[PDB]
A paper describes a structure:
Additionally, we report the 1.9 Å crystal structure of tetrameric [name] and demonstrate that this oligomeric state is stable in solution suggesting that the physiologically relevant assembly of [name] is tetrameric. Two homodimers form a doughnut-like tetramer where the buried surface area between each monomer at the dimer-dimer interface of the tetramer is 1454 Å2 (calculated with AreaiMol), which is ∼8.2% of the total surface area. The dimer-dimer interface is facilitated by weak interactions between residues from both domains. As there are no existing butyryl-CoA transferase structures, the 1.9 Å [name] crystal structure, which demonstrates the canonical Family I CoA transferases α/β fold, is compared against 4-HB-CoAT structures. The overall fold amongst the [name] and 4-HB-CoAT structures are highly conserved with RMSDs between 1.57–1.68 Å in pairwise structural alignments. The [name] structure most likely represents a form similar to the unbound form crystallized with glycerol, as [name] was also crystallized with glycerol. The pocket size, which restricts the size of the acyl group that can bind effectively, appears to be large enough to accommodate acyl groups of three to four carbon atoms and helps explain the competition and DSF assays.
The [name] gene encodes for a protein highly homologous to 4-hydroxybutyrate-CoA transferase (4-HB-CoAT), which belongs to a superfamily of CoA transferases responsible for the transfer of the CoAS− anion from a donor CoA thioester to an acceptor free acid. Further, CoA transferase activity assays suggest that [name] has a preference for butyryl or propionyl moieties compared to 4-hydroxybutyryl.
Numbering used by the authors:
A (entry chain B), B (entry chain A): 1 to 440
């Protein structure tokens, strides 16, 4: 089996590589940084030329890469976004559509991220899959790098798999993370830095928040850190710990810093002992570079990583997630769009459930108590509509004013303890609302 | 070892049995038919005489026995309902309380039923547990009979366990279903028929619904279903099947009929092969008598039965649940009280999740399309507030007009297909609503 010959055989231009994708078919691509820019630019060009139509693209975790190519508003009639998370890119599209005669331009597909591999392969069906990969090694394998998720599965289930080789994509070890040249239909090469998450600055509230959380992290904790600035930054208060583990949905810079520092050994885990487990990674160049050939990091597919039964196997799980609002029932909301709920597709609830089921486990959902320079309360009477984390599932809630374990508390006990986590400026107003709702 | 000597030492009157329960303590009891009428009457009398106070009662599945005695409105100032399900009994109390100067008289404790054993025993803590049991056998064991649920844990974890022996309570085999006299603190005897779930008349829509559902059940299916005329009718249609299995939260007369007919054999199950598994039972005298000493019926605790990971290990699970409303997003609502959501505490979602995870599994949620002589649609634009089954979890929905599998469908595809399950009188209005909501 000659790999070098197979490679040359499949190597081609972005233009020719995407030239065969059928109108009326289903396409998917990797998450975030994995989105292949050369391939997506060439696909967008096809649409611009009017050479493809009715192409449904099903995907999670949008990046400017897709935002600026296939997803551009002008192509919305030809490349139809079947978005499975609604992010800043989709929010902008949706608002533009509303302005343009109330046009629906984003087709949200409700789902559980943890079920994405089966949903895409079996319910939806994907004909073409495209993903950035690390360069082929001397045994004929590419790596999915920062992506496993549903990507490992759809790379195989799709009729055609097209890869974009990028020397900047780290070579990552993981379950089905390695792709043999024989599993690939076409190859293009494009060496450019991976897209980064924005770096964010700490706010004063994070000191209290991080301090409160630290007191809640037991010896040998097995960490998951949710998306957002808060869990990424709170991670740093654990610099002084030892023998921590990682089993997380998203691998972020804060977690990788703990690995770098030797804080994370993974020696107290039941599953994947000795290796930090994640399903996809987002960060900056320093983090991406560090992942390359790292023998103590191991990606796994999302249907493993985000299975609460699997999460719970490891003792002393600590899940730290952020939210946008907490209401007086103890329900939480991470959705930016008022009156909508797309964020429930995320893996937050998987870890809320999984951490609580872990022996010695704790789920923490945290937020500053206010927004807009202290003028807006993030502790509210009642969330408008369907929630992200239901009140029956919430475990620990934290603001800069303290922590409350909600499990086993009555609705009266909950409302009273939650009001005390609000900023003093709002407690009277919240107490009256609770009275009106008959929560107390 | 001398069990008759132990029985005689522990045997007492209901009045004496409940006399040492502390004020300001936590009491729990069995579910439904499990509630002990003589003990509960004696406890209520104790409150009436002003001899106990600040007694919190934590419980699920209320029955007339509880409503008639301890839960009587007039005793609300001494015996505090910390209800974990809100049923007809609590709805009546809540409404009466609002009328009576807007008083809060029921204190809902949000939870997952599947976590009840741990929540009651650990976060909440139970000082006294009371449960009706079958007569002591020659080895010194009583059976919890109709109830396992969280009862088998709390009978052991409560600081005192008081039983009410009733020869009408069947001797049921199960995991931790049998409790030795050495584990019982006091005994009273009260032989009276168990309370029955009322038999309700079928509505016309159930004929079509039971056939659509039955068409979705293959031979070898492993069934879970609720109580009522509809499930009874479904079981009626299923009388022609073979080698069905049972793994259900509640065991009902319909399922027991299939056992009696030899339709249910449990030979195709992966877990508990050969035995019908349930966590509590509700029905009529004929069904209760049938459970007595049945070697092929096996109760198990709710943290096993309602664990989606456990449910999913059996192939071809079919979960059949009812709902009150379905909205155009595919979310379902089972809560009777407008604007509120107490029904999410029930096990419906456990089985929605577990059935989908099962190999060949299907979760079905069914409702007639209208209410009130066809004047009100049960298919609605949008549920008012938090839901029972989230749109991200719904699998199959059914009305008298057919069935839809929602998995993998966009918001537009869902709305369009769901409207076709609504009564013709409402389809135009629902389509308009869908457009306004920007679903389509």
């Amino acid at each position: 089996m000659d790999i070098r010959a197979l490679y040359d055989e499949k190597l081609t231009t972005p233009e020719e590589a995407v030239s065969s994708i059928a109108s009326g078919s289903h396409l998917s691509m990797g998450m975030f940084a994995a989105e292949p820019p050369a391939l997506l630019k060439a696909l967008a060009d096809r649409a611009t030329r009017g050479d493809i139509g009715d192409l449904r693209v099903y995907y999670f975790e949008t990046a400017k890469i897709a935002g600026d190519t296939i997803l551009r508003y002008e192509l919305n009639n030809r490349i139809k976004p079947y978005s499975m998370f609604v992010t800043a890119v989709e929010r902008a599209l949706i608002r533009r559509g509303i302005e343009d005669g109330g046009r629906k331009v984003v087709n949200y597909v409700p789902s559980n991220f943890h079920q994405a591999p089966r949903l895409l392969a079996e319910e939806i069906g994907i004909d073409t899959f495209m993903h950035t990969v690390s360069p082929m090694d001397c045994h004929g394998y590419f790596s999915l790098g920062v992506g496993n998720d549903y990507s490992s599965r759809i790379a195989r289930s799709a009729r055609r798999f097209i890869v974009e080789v990028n020397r900047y994509m780290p070579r990552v070890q993981g379950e089905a993370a390695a792709i043999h040249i024989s599993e690939v239909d076409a190859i293009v090469e494009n060496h450019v830095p991976l897209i980064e998450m924005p770096v964010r600055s700490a706010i004063p509230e994070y000191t209290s928040i991080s301090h409160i959380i630290a007191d809640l992290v037991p010896d040998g904790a097995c960490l998951q850190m949710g998306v957002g600035a808060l869990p990424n930054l709170v991670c740093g208060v654990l610099k002084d710990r030892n023998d921590l583990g990682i089993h997380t949905e998203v691998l972020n810079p804060g977690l990788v810093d703990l690995i770098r520092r030797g804080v994370v050994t993974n020696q107290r885990k039941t599953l994947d002992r000795g290796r930090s487990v994640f399903t996809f990674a987002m960060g900056q160049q320093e983090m991406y570079e560090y992942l390359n050939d790292h023998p103590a990091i191991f990606s796994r597919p999302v249907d493993y990583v985000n299975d609460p039964h699997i999460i719970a196997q490891n003792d002393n799980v600590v899940s730290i997630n952020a939210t946008l609002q907490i209401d007086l029932t103890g329900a939480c909301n991470s959705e930016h769009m008022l009156g909508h709920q797309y964020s429930a597709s995320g893996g937050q609830l998987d870890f809320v459930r999984g951490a609580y089921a872990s022996k010695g486990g704790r789920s923490i959902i945290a937020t500053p108590s206010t927004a807009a320079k202290g003028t807006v309360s993030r502790i509210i009477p009642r969330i408008d509509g369907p929630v992200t984390t239901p009140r029956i599932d919430t475990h620990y809630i934290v603001t800069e004013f303290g922590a409350v374990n909600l499990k086993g508390l009555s609705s009266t006990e909950r409302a009273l303890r939650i009001i005390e986590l609000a900023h003093p400026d709002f407690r009277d107003e919240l107490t009256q609302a609770a009275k009106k709702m008959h929560l107390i």
